[PDB]
Symmetry: C3
Subunit: 213 residues, 3 copies
């Protein structure tokens, strides 16, 4: 997009795993982001599912500048403008809509919207997008489904998310159309609340390592 | 909606089961609605799949005022206006479209549209809807798929329909996002053909009973 | 459509099988189209997946009067206008979008767009379409899924495509809503190189024959 400083592609090629974080206790946002970076993971998706989500993005955005923090669960222009003002570097949505796609493309940060069908993908392509999230990965039919959908579009790249785990993520990563995946196991809600940051750094390290081949 | 007397939520919380009725002979509409009410089921979805569907709705509307009669298979604004004039108290559609979503929200009765993807759900939410039908439930990937889709939306409630039976409906009912399900087995075409209204009342009773827990 | 000379229905009732052709070398377009016609197959879908796809359509369109050549993989109005100018008699898309449906319906050739959900089908019906492609057939849940989706729409007809083979195509053809299927096995990428057009004609013959009942 003529309006995006950083491309959606760069966001997804930074690493094989994008942690989908849920922050309960704002106080744990920064130490958490640092634990992940120490583990090799710098692209963080902070989902708008808690009251402090936006503040978490703003905090991380300024105290851990080495991290590329973004917003998750962006459902409409209002939230897009909100996380953009808070310092998010990218936004991810479980699905797409014209209003959201129109705000995104006129906005200043890349949006990587999720799709389940070829039509939704084509709608997204109508606005010039090439990077999408495949959601809910598993529910949509996993790897075989994605291969069927991706088939006709060589230039399109995806970030599968939904029911993906250490047990299956290499299966998605092995696809040509897949740049990375969305994993929510790098930050257990328990370890977060418990301030157990070493657990988090270990998970990230292993995630990254287990991605090779 | 500022234009809806009764909410879509009330329609779905009335009972765990919503029978999806197909009427081929107008003469059986009233005696059928009464059989279901006698069995504990008062929310009836009369699908626009037969020539007498609308007349069936109008008849039930006055012959059985204890029943909340609605229309099913509403595909466009024309049919919405039609069943609304005939006395339908609610409308259900296998899918959604902006023309239909706009029409419904300006209209006077609640529309509970079906969705299969997050994008379709988000389009529906753009018009303020919170109650949707999950169709075709099974074909879309059943309970696991619905859980994936529902996940990001705590305030949204569904009414799964499509391939649901006595054998699996408690699985859907057990979900927090599910208020009720669409069942088409309460009115066996035959039973009706053989005017076994007692068969119908028995099925309804059992359906309701088998829903507890 | 008031603007379409030939209907989308005629395109699909011409034969039980519509070959989805991939042409890499323009020199094989005409001899190939003739091989298929000799085998009984006259409706050809030349997919826009190679540089010479459009030239192949133009060549066949003028060289082989006994066939009905169309374009496949049409993703937007630009390509629709392009294949229309090249002589395509119909266009097929893996999905649908309002820009494409609007351009198509204002255009002069029938578009048979693919769908996976009821909503996408309803969007297509909003523009007056009745013939659709079911894609990706298998990935969407095959015959059971299609039956679920087709159910509420008696007037709608489909052309399943995606994972369909000589092993399952009669299963789809057996459905009342199905007029024909998209098969990509009538033209082996190999048969083209060695220039074994007889192999192609044999496959077409067998395809047609194996469709009876």
């Amino acid at each position: 997009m003529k309006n995006w400083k950083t491309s959606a592609e760069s966001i997804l090629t930074t690493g094989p795993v994008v942690p989908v974080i849920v922050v309960k206790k704002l106080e744990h946002a920064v130490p958490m982001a640092k634990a992940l970076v120490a583990g090799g993971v710098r692209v963080l998706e902070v989902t708008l599912r808690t009251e402090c989500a936006v503040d978490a993005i703003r905090a991380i955005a300024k105290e851990v500048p080495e991290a590329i923090v973004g917003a998750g669960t962006v459902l409409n222009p209002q939230q897009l403008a909100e996380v953009t003002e808070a310092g998010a570097q990218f936004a991810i949505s479980p699905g797409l809509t014209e209003p959201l796609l129109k705000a995104a493309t006129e906005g200043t940060i890349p949006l990587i919207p999720g799709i389940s069908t070829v039509s939704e993908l084509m709608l997204g392509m109508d606005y010039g997008l090439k990077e999408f999230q495949f959601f809910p990965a598993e529910a949509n039919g996993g790897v075989k489904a994605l291969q069927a959908i991706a088939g006709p579009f060589s230039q399109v790249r995806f970030c599968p998310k939904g029911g993906i785990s250490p047990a299956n993520y290499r299966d998605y990563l092995a696809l040509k159309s897949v740049l990375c995946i969305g994993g929510s196991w790098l930050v257990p809600a328990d370890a977060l609340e418990a301030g157990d940051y070493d657990r988090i750094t270990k998970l990230a390290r292993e995630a990254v390592e287990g991605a090779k081949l």
